[PDB]
Write a protein that binds this ligand. Structure first.
Ligand code: ZN
Ligand code: ZN
Ligand code: ZN
Ligand code: ZN
Ligand code: ZN
Lengths: 134, 136, 137, 138, 138
């Protein structure tokens, strides 16, 4: 709908779930020395569900929007279902895999496939998440 | 241009969704969840007789479900329950079926493009199904 | 082409933030319009300090075109002589209804020039103007 | 540039929506008016002069987005400048919009209206506020 | 060319309208001013040094949208970095906009100004803040 341009802008300027989790079950950071992106993901698990999740860090607009979108994409889902969006998303931008409708707002970051130099900027948050949920 | 205006309508509603929130003394509420996208919604309405005196929606999902929910509450607020149902059928005929858009849909016509996006049709109709469920 | 798409932005801006939206208690005259085609409704109120349209505002719920049109309408008419407003009304209708070459004198109104290609939406744009014409007398 | 052309468009839109220095100016040293009936634009420029410098300036009127944005951008470009300087900027501005000549960066945000050179029927919409300024300073 | 283009335009607009680290830096260790004699852009960069680390940095000035956005983006890019890392960024930024070199990925959000390279006469509006930074750090 090309309104995905707004999704990117919205999340870049108003990142969701940005901050610290008082009580967290899992936590893992990530960093990109080159661009200067850094993100730490905190997660609260209840059973096999991501009860709450938040991120912290600074970096380019792409990494900030990606972290925001990722937190919104997995909150309330099961760890398994979360790891599936991760592997998938990494496909949309790393291997240039084909788009997937079940990614919803995450689609807004397809173009990252192009300009493979910034792919690192978009997967930082997802790597941190997987390192947390493992 | 029509295409330019519809794009702008969807953006405006995604950015500033109308009637977002909760109704304190809601006559009847109803919730809804999406299987293919995982969109979740809940609609609350205040009825004075058979007129939707007020309505509100909350929850969240993709941009489409939010814009569609906003446009929906805007179109039915203050309207007769029967009118809300009339708009709902017209909307679904447009989005679900390839049916030629009913001109009385107004700004809801901006979501016409979803008709050619299955797996995304449920993102648009979620709010409407919850509304119907809320109106009994 | 920084300007080549300015009209679209002007139009989109008026849809988003329509001007003179509200009411004018004690308006010299008022008039309402409605086209069941799209389901639009409009209320026009004007301040006639004699022969000039001092202030003006519009009410009613309708689609984006009806909203933008009535917005662009009030901005193009406020503070102008009654006759001047009607002159613009004719020029505007000539543009959207008859699809005639838009009169450059229309200024910002040219933002709606594309409506001439939309038979099903012509009344959406002209509604605010017909209401204006009924009020102004 | 594309990204830059869009930044400029945003600048124009901003000045269109919220023009700067818009309104009457108390103690105005002088003021001049201008009309561009070809479009239906009208503008009034008022200046407060102190020596050879424009201490303050404002404009009023109504018209297309281009003329209003040109008026707003013009007030911001000359406020606090030397009368001769303002006139110099007006020279360069009209040279860009009327002669399509290569505009130097000393026009700054005014460069947003550079494309008007390719739009003969809009040149007067852009130059109106400046002719008024010049007449208000003469 | 349009996904990030859209985002880049937004970044520029946002930094120009709401520049970051804009104000006087009281505890400034060193500072330097830069000026584009013609465009009228002026900037002053103040840095608070702790060892070889730029602990804080702020800028002051007035000018065109490009110069403001650039100064804003520059302060964000170098705050918290070592002096040598800031000078490298400056070198890369100038290679991008002055030499038109293949934009170095490490520039991040600064890549939003890559397009200024296509407008030679406006390149000085983008580099002004960086020259002031370098002078302050010398
Ligand atoms: Zn990055
Ligand atoms: Zn959805
Ligand atoms: Zn209509
Ligand atoms: Zn004009
Ligand atoms: Zn400059």
């Amino acid at each position: 709908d090309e309104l995905y341009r707004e999704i990117l802008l919205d999340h870049y300027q108003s990142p969701r779930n940005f901050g610290v989790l008082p009580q967290a079950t899992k936590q893992a950071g990530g960093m990109n020395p080159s661009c200067g992106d850094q993100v730490e993901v905190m997660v609260l698990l209840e059973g096999d569900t991501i009860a709450d999740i938040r991120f912290q860090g600074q970096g380019c607009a792409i990494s900030t929007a990606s972290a925001s979108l990722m937190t919104e994409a997995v909150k309330g889902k099961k760890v398994a279902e979360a790891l599936e969006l991760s592997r998938k998303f990494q496909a949309m931008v790393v291997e240039g895999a084909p788009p997937d409708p079940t990614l919803g707002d995450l689609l807004a970051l397809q173009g990252v496939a192009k300009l493979p130099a910034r792919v690192k900027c978009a997967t930082l948050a997802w790597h941190a998440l997987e390192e947390a949920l493992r």
